Chain length 235, copies 8
């Protein structure tokens, strides 16, 4: 019942809002020497790990327009819920990004940690990089959220927050490691700096997409009906 | 004779060209932890110290549209030589900035070390900061280039390259420490990023100006004729 | 029957049209000393109080894209009627704003009383302010339009026009007190001055929204079915 | 000697700087009811009256690119001094306008009291109005600064600050009463709002001009040589 | 059957195409003295009169996004057919306008007879004028296309082409007499001159609309069910 | 003496001002049938014929930046006087164009009779046309203003106003017949419609130029020294 | 089943991707003398011939938003499949165009073989040309894909790849021979050069459209029901 | 005498005009296979060779703002004559480019043979390339125009037209081989395509400059006074 749909939508609004707030608010590279990298990288992972322990208990804790797209291709969600989530994540983001702005001194709140391709990196490589970052990440979630799979994986939250962290350990250097359009979106709107911005929807969309592909049919397929299950779209 | 005017103009073209090249090419903050600050800061000082040991022996080694302006108000140069120098420094800069570009890998040659005001800093403070940076700097040159003054100052080049370095030790954080329009100019032209750029002419112009003022009349005045000397403009 | 839907839509077109016309046409701050504030503030309240005595008898007299949104989240209207109303209010506004323009001398019809954030106020505070203005206002309407509640409230029209007036007594200083997108919209279109304009949809949308929330579930909830009632959307 | 030229230029820089600062800083219409009009109007007059008691003792205290133009046509100044003054007034203005900005809270420092034509007023009337404002004003200065004229005029400063004040008592309603390009210039540059801005150079330029005309030849002519005196331009 | 829907759509594409072609191609005011007015005015009427004798026999011969809107409010058409017609008229227009362009020498095919508000006329009057032009015109069609009405009206085509002509006899002076968005559209697209262009959709839309109103309910109402007939929208 | 230079400059300001005012104010094609052509064409001629009877008695009555250029190449004027005239004609124009604007109802004062190339005419032909128009015109003035030539030419004013008129009888159709940049300038500035505007400086500049050429050396040369006379530039 | 819909969509993504890649990657006119024409012309034909032998075995191998539109009017597809194909071809294109970019040296990958109208050709002729190119091409596919027709046509792939080739043999000179919006689209997006770009959707859309017309009803009609078959749209 | 200055200026106007006309009008690459290269390359050389046989007999036949700059640094011309030439070459160019336009069918007169950097070439290399092209070219002219040098060089015209041709044989591939700003200028103005245009002033300016350097002092110096000769600037 709606007491579920609208909860999940809010859990997705709050879960994304905090994600941006904490993640982004740690990324304000206030610390040059000790690579912000291990810092912001685990920040984003723990942030996600907590939100999944917390929210993944109600909505799924996608907090990522890429993952929500990845479950949609995945013939797991409804295009409705799948669009409610993206608007709730985008609103979450921007909101968590507004708050961070209101709480952090100017001198720190620069560009709000806006994802920006690395200097010599160009957009195609950038886009390549964001593809692999979302793919490994979307592949990790599909595999931890996948019931049939079980035994001893421990914690989905870590099993998934470390995926996000590995994403950044690598991709903060190539693209700042957005791998979440919401997250690239939010500070693109508040700073009005939409430069090389599309790299961040395409890259993770295609990544997410050809990640739910590389799992659902390629790696760990489905043992009943594929055409029958696609009826979830119609409801 | 012109064999002097045109030398000085070239010495100013080369002396500025290298200045940008070395200075800027060190500033490419390839090193986060060990503050680029002590690095790029002494880079700019040594760069200047060498150019002054080298070129200050022929033209004066201003390599700075602010200093050339400071000597002009200073009723020391001709508005001609004073304009030849600025166009030779701007051309020097851009040229030394073109070369650096051609020699440094993309991944390193980001924005070419473009002077950009610090995040929470606004333009007026920025402008304030650039004023004090050029003032202390233009004051140090006036006082080391000032013959009547003597005894034991040691080396003008250091006596002046440390001034530039103190400028950066402070002002790389507020404004990136341009304190040389040429230097802010050159990468503004190659990257086509003229944002908050005027802060860098005003700030150092006014600094230079009210620096040749704070010395020539205020601190260490002139003991003959002030109105008579101003005849240098007419030649 | 449509003889109701289309009436309400017109009542909403006229009711909004007059609202803008009277409200806005009083706000033309022709009177500096005696704060336009008590003036335009009661103007907007009486205007609303009359339109509600008048029109609230047929459509609801929302004359405010924020209130119409607030009843929609409120699971009280149909997304259809809810969109018919907003287009009828926007058309009402602009029309009532066109007329005012045609009747008032230039020297008076300046910017048509365009909502503009106060000088030192920034957009986030502005947005904050518009949130609280629509919240208290949308909360007052929900509570006066709420049947179960009764006894001795007197007049909904006043019980609601004073809410609008309190909105302005406060918010004309922070944001000009739009708290009605229609009202900010109309003179934004005729003067082509859409500056800081979004502050006026967001601010009151979120206000209206988290106002129908703070009442419907928080303060004075519903005693039957929440998931069942949401079937009104489907008709 | 330059000890005079450069003094006057500074006296004109400071005298204009304060003028903008005080004038403009009073005009921040912090007081609606009691017409800012008598307030800002005498502010600008006293400001001028003081600057003339003060500076008119050294440079002339034009603090107005219109008056400096008016003395130039007036075949009283050199095109050099006449251009030094305008750049010193424009720099004065902007500087006095920067300071005001740094000292006054946002909530007060709105548009910095930017001259803006009145609503129904159009640009030609506006331009007409600024013409008459500078004409009466430039006529009053010519007549108080005019030696041959004497007897009992009392104080030039008042004899001239009341002229400025009468200018505003009238023209703050039509154009905000710039009648000083410097003064319209300065907040046009800091707020980057050059709307209907030219109205403020033309209007007062033509006013000043056909004001030094209406006096020098029309009303109170010259009794020696007109063609001979014009040799002042050549020095 | 579609053999009707798609015919009408083509009849509307051709019928509009010729309308623009002939109408517009006569309006190329190649004749100053003999007012183009009687000329282009009857051109547009005959053009319409012929297209209605011709096409009004199959689709209705609206050849006017305003009339098609007028029948839609009129609860006579389907929103589908009503949108098919407008896209077929817009395509008709542009096509008939392309052809005219390809057949008429440059020296003649100026702006393609683009509707442009008259000089001193402003947009609101313009919009007023286009309202009355479409109203009288949409009122004439409703009344000639209205079966219950009969007896001796003679020819609908004239009974309707004279309406168009009276529209122009009047409105070519105020607005060029578009009274057909298609017709204002087509040369707005080929000449890329969309100036005061909206005046031509609004004006005739509102005219058409409050014209099908002034007839359907006001003047010559309906004697069965109004709410029941509105079921045509659903098919 | 200046009592001559400054007179001529004013005579050129007024003489141009009226020219635009009368000429342009007749050209407001209030009369379609009776070609505005004979009308505006003689208007411009008489206007010129009067201004030359009137002003050509003091300054030369060029009232045309093209003719003033034509006398300059003509080694007849000083580059100073030649620039004073153009700024006085441009100011004259705009002023005479402002006045016309203030005196003529909107409905008449459309685009202020802005010169605009004819529809099928392109810019090169246009430019060609304006060349021949200024050439025949500049040739007629050179030949009527040329003393050595005499006998029985009657009236220079007609001998020159008919030249202007023949210019228009022809060129109002190709280019509106500017053949006076001042005249194309003035309504280009007030209406802010600088379209195909350069056609009007080039075309008449080159015309004027290669017109003072086709006369001074080609047709009716000079019988003393050509290199010696060019000393007029130096004074 | 979807195992068909989604295959076809991919076959259309890959089939278009290669088409652009091979076609476009041959068209990089690396060879001036030997007309690129026979080269790129057969390249595009073989490319298509192979993709049809290959993919036309599963989806139809439209690889052309024009052909997919042509089958849609053709009442052969569903508007859904018809839109899935165009987004899959556009994505195919851009992707095949991205790859080509990543594999071909700069010096070769100029504008990516962007369709651009020929110099003296204008847009209407261009549009005319693209119409005939898509018409003959869409007519050839309709006739080879048309079962009832049979006997001895040999190979559809050639029977269709030669059609594409004849298209280019002709139209590379007039328009570069896009005749495939996907193909004009892809390098318009990567080079950001959308000049005269619409010529390439219109031209081939209208061509395709009035090509499925010239066959389905005109030349080789249908012998059962036309209105009944149109039920495919509803599924 | 001027009978020389003004001749040379015209000879430079015509000599440049034809140069553009013939050169450019041959370059209209109407012939793909037989490299336009040998064609346009000798076209530009012969064009120059003829203009030098023809005009180099009066003005020098620079027909190149780069060469005129090269003689200026060369302390051979006056900054006056040196600026007269550039404006006469730019006017020559554009004029010869206008004519070509008026004589050549559209289908041929594409972009007017606009210099455009080669695809993979970037601007710095481009600029590098244009430097070497003007250097070898400016070096060849200095050495053929250099009297002291003699004996048996044959024809300066060839001795110089082959230099231009070698310039193109090489540089039409890298930059289209402008090596004449006039020549890049002229079609940049008529086609309004100023893309990568500065590459063509810088590149050849610096080339010309450091070419008159590499000869005058480096390779074949001067045996009298260098400071004394520079007095030519003062006349
Ligand atoms: C299905 C996908 C599976 C994923 C697996 C594929 C991953 C590999 C993709 C790598 C991206 C290639 C782009 C690149 O690293 O270099 C492109 C090229 C660089 O020059 P060059 O190496 O060709 O030769 C010059 C050699 N020399 C420097 C020694 C002289 O040109 C330039 O402008 C510089 C780069 C500008 C961006 C171009 C992006 C191309 C789009 C990627 C293709 C993906 C298709 C969707
Ligand atoms: C769920 C919501 C419940 C509603 C209850 C919350 C109401 C409170 C919200 C207040 C808005 C905060 C914005 C503000 O008043 O000041 C932001 C900050 C000012 O500097 P500072 O105070 O941080 O420190 C400098 C201190 N010193 C001046 C002494 C040196 O930066 C600036 O640029 C100036 C302001 C520019 C606009 C920034 C808006 C932030 C977005 C609001 C957050 C709402 C999330 C949707
Ligand atoms: C239902 C369709 C069936 C297809 C069969 C029709 C195929 C024929 C269409 C031909 C296109 C006509 C455009 C054209 O070749 O020349 C247009 C015109 C050229 O001047 P002129 O020949 O009229 O007279 C000047 C004569 N003199 C040069 C000797 C002085 O004007 C200009 O600006 C130059 C051309 C600029 C583009 C204009 C395109 C017009 C739109 C085409 C119509 C299609 C309707 C959808």
């Amino acid at each position: 019942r709606s007491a579920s749909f609208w909860r999940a939508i809010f859990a997705e609004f709050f879960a994304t809002l905090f994600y941006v707030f904490f993640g982004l608010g740690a990324s304000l590279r206030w610390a040059p020497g000790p690579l912000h990298v291990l810092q912001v990288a685990l920040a984003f992972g723990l942030a996600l790990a907590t939100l999944v322990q917390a929210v993944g208990h109600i909505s799924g804790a996608h907090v990522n327009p890429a993952v929500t797209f990845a479950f949609l291709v995945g013939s797991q969600m409804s295009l409705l819920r799948a669009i409610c989530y993206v608007v709730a994540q985008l609103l979450g983001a921007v909101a968590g990004a507004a708050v961070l702005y209101s709480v952090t001194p100017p001198a720190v709140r620069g560009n709000l940690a806006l994802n920006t391709l690395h200097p010599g990196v160009s957009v195609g490589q950038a886009t390549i990089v964001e593809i692999f970052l979302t793919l490994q990440f979307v592949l990790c979630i599909f595999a931890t959220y996948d019931e049939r799979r079980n035994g001893r994986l421990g914690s989905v939250a870590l099993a998934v927050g470390f995926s996000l962290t590995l994403g950044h350990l690598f991709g903060m250097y190539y693209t700042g490691a957005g791998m979440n359009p919401a997250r690239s979106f939010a500070p693109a709107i508040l700073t009005r700096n939409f430069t090389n911005h599309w790299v961040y929807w395409v890259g993770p969309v295609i990544g997410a997409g050809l990640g739910s592909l590389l799992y659902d049919f390629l790696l760990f397929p489905r043992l009943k009906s594929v055409s029958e299950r696609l009826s979830i779209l119609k409801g």
